[PDB]
Amino acid sequence: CNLARCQLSCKSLGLKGGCQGSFCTCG
């Protein structure tokens, strides 16, 4: 899970992106 890439995906939705192990989730 990449933080910069995961954060960009969450940023498009309008949330913070946190990587847990190898999964990207927005919170």
Where is 25: in which H helix or E strand?
A: strand 23-26
How far is residue 2's CA from residue 4's CA, in Å, rounded to a whole number?
6
Residues 6+ apart with CB under 8 A from 4: none
Tell me the technique behind this structure: NMR
- Dihedrals φ, ψ of 16, to 5°? -85, 140
* Residue matched to tokens 């999964």: 23
Q: What are 6's two structure tokens?
A: 């995961």
Q: What are 10's two structure tokens?
A: 């969450």
Tell me the torsion sign for CA atoms 23, 24, 25, 27.
Answer: positive
How far is residue 21's CA from residue 27's CA, in Å, rounded to a whole number?
15
Residues 6+ apart with CB under 8 A from 5: 24
AA letter at 4: A
Question: Is 5:18 a contact under the CB 8 Å cutoff?
Answer: no
Cite the DSSP H helix spans in 1-27.
3-13
